[PDB]
Symmetry: T
Subunit: 64 residues, 12 copies
């Protein structure tokens, strides 16, 4: 059985690096992370000093 | 990093109050709740005494 | 077996009340109405004296 | 010919009132506003003192 | 309030049995599982000895 | 001209048998049923003794 | 309250004429037909002597 | 950079002519119109003397 | 077994004729073409002398 | 690099067996078939002696 | 109230830089730009000397 | 007439480079490649030594 968690990563550099930021967090706390699916991308402008790229991913991990 | 949980709130009064019911539950158990996105709305009729409005939300919270 | 009918309710008050208007009509004419799913919401402006909120629902009822 | 503008209204009270807030703004600046279609709903939590309901609408107006 | 978890079940037999595999896992660890919605179906071929059917479900459970 | 009706079939056995349950009902009451399109699948758990598979179909029939 | 019926019109000439074929049928049998929304378009080739254009519409009519 | 405006053209003749009606209006007021994407089609019936076909397009134009 | 190919037809006349242009090409090179599904429509303006209507279709053909 | 082909399998027995029918055909003619994604399901009724289940899949294969 | 404009940025380097190109243009002409949502990505090949990455964004700005 | 092929490119570096990997393969084997549309993005983790970014594109080419 796989389970997915819905995470938004952030980066001041790129959409790829924002995806990595989410996956990094998943790997910090979960075993057997197997893949990620991109489900949204965006850019935060008004709330930050530098533009911040965001990539939202479903991160899949194998249970048991 | 943000994470989202997928919650359906209920209310005998309105779709807005059903959204609040979900967000209230998230705030009971999670720190740093930052926003919610409505993803579905519905009305339960046959299983209840009074019509019950339901609003399903992805509730986003900031990790760490 | 359930069947659904696709109804747009209207209200001069709210999206919740517009959903109720559709469900009310379904219950006038159908037995065993069990739930409704919201599929669209809108506001009529140019054709009416007062803004009219509209909520379109699939209203499900149990056959037999 | 109709044209649409994509507006997000806000309210501390309800999704219906947030839709009205957008339509009000459109009517301040545009002639012949004829209808609105709801395209998204959400709730701002972390950036505000009170929860703020948001309703995004395509507001249609007749040209010429 | 209901909450959903996003699970992919697997089976060497059928899409129905793959859905059951996910629901079984949810019932092992959660109380008050109430329904599941199918959100994707697929077949793993290259990574397995026998074709493996997969059915991804949002499994809903009642909180509290 | 074709017309479609939106039916949810049920089965304690499989998603295929749930689709058949809907189509069977359509054929009981309608002439010239020509095809069905699957539009949703789900599993009822909390309201039933045995898990019940549900398959929602648009059932198309030829008018006249 | 509005209700919609889901009809596929056909024409050997065009997608516009296929939409008209559906609307014509609705007006034969229903009072107060008010609008139609196109939801799919296609072309039947193998089952017919001449290519047949098909346009599927939700035809809305006002109840009461 | 391209920008798009969301226009609904109308015609008493066809969906193609309704698309042209929108594009014509864009070309009246904008320089460097480069393409259009159809996003919806419909037919107005109750508000008009003759059926009126409508085609909604995102009309893209090059800035600068 | 059916297979589909994803073709964009073009016409200086209409969306229907653009669909035909794609289907014509499929029939030039494939046996047993059975139907087509419209998946997108658009208009090329900047790259052409005359507006060019485009209709993208999945063209289905029976294998073997 | 992976490539996908869009195939509709058929079966007089089940949606799972219809998916297998498509994958079987892909494996007859292609090397390195790695997975399939279900994209539609349906039932043919009017054109056949027995109901025929159909499952449409994108079948992915590795190039080179 | 927020308003969105629908812009396609371009870059010979990356999808991230194409998003920035759109946002840059918005900030040239608009006050209070607050965020952007990615809605499409593509690559122009035939019309250009070098491949050109394109990222289409809804750029949101606060009115008043 | 344009035709599209559905390709998933891969890269250990970025989503942009994964798109290029697919387009490169198309240009190896096809004449008159004209554009690509991004349709999905993902990251392979469990099956590889280094995270592998994947970008799925419809690559369009002009026939004849
Ligand atoms: C992708 C994205 C979407 C957003 N949407 C909203 C919104 O709907 N309302 C809001 O007050 N702020 C937003 N913000 C700040 C956003 C920010 C980003 C990066
Ligand atoms: C929005 C909504 C959707 C529902 N869908 C189903 C369903 O598919 N099958 C079912 O047995 N009960 C339902 N029920 C009870 C529902 C109830 C609600 C409120
Ligand atoms: C949600 C909504 C959508 C509508 N769409 C259209 C349309 O496409 N064309 C039209 O002539 N009138 C409309 N009207 C009047 C509308 C009215 C509402 C309330
Ligand atoms: C509906 C909604 C969506 C939002 N999405 C985002 C987002 O993607 N990223 C972000 O930094 N802030 C958001 N914010 C603050 C949002 C706020 C709202 C109300
Ligand atoms: C439904 C399904 C989808 C898949 N998608 C991918 C993919 O995008 N990339 C990949 O390397 N492997 C996959 N695999 C292995 C898949 C496997 C299945 C069963
Ligand atoms: C597919 C499916 C969806 C459902 N959705 C809901 C829902 O939204 N709310 C609810 O009270 N019950 C449901 N129920 C009971 C459901 C049941 C099924 C089988
Ligand atoms: C738009 C369209 C879609 C169709 N889809 C199918 C299908 O999925 N299976 C089938 O046996 N026949 C079809 N047929 C015959 C079709 C025919 C048309 C016109
Ligand atoms: C495509 C289309 C959609 C429409 N939708 C609505 C609606 O939702 N409510 C309404 O009062 N009128 C409409 N009208 C009048 C419409 C008219 C058209 C042509
Ligand atoms: C439907 C359609 C869509 C198009 N999209 C784009 C695009 O995204 N970028 C571009 O440079 N050119 C386009 N072009 C030229 C287009 C042309 C048409 C006809
Ligand atoms: C899933 C499915 C869809 C279909 N759609 C159509 C259609 O749109 N028009 C038609 O003449 N026949 C169809 N047919 C025969 C179909 C058959 C199937 C099995
Ligand atoms: C994303 C994208 C989509 C496009 N779509 C089309 C199209 O549909 N027709 C066309 O003539 N050119 C296009 N072009 C040139 C395109 C170009 C791009 C970059
Ligand atoms: C985007 C993506 C999606 C995937 N989906 C699946 C899946 O559904 N099942 C599976 O066994 N493996 C997958 N895999 C390995 C995937 C891999 C990727 C990169
Ligand atoms: Cl989710
Ligand atoms: Cl429907
Ligand atoms: Cl828009
Ligand atoms: Cl495809
Ligand atoms: Mg930096
Ligand atoms: Mg988002
Ligand atoms: Mg009360
Ligand atoms: Mg729901
Ligand atoms: Mg009042
Ligand atoms: Mg509507
Ligand atoms: Mg207050
Ligand atoms: Mg939004
Ligand atoms: Mg076995
Ligand atoms: Mg999947
Ligand atoms: Mg049994
Ligand atoms: Mg459902
Ligand atoms: Mg003729
Ligand atoms: Mg169809
Ligand atoms: Mg005339
Ligand atoms: Mg519309
Ligand atoms: Mg001419
Ligand atoms: Mg297109
Ligand atoms: Mg048999
Ligand atoms: Mg289909
Ligand atoms: Mg360079
Ligand atoms: Mg695009
Ligand atoms: Mg490297
Ligand atoms: Mg994918
Ligand atoms: Na989730
Ligand atoms: Na817009
Ligand atoms: Na219907
Ligand atoms: Na394809």
């Amino acid at each position: 059985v796989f389970k997915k968690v819905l995470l938004t990563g952030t980066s001041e550099e790129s959409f790829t690096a924002a995806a990595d930021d989410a996956i990094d967090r998943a790997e910090d706390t979960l075993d057997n992370v197997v893949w990620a699916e991109v489900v949204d991308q965006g850019v935060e402008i008004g709330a930050v000093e530098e533009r911040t790229y965001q990539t939202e991913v479903q991160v899949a991990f194998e249970l048991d």
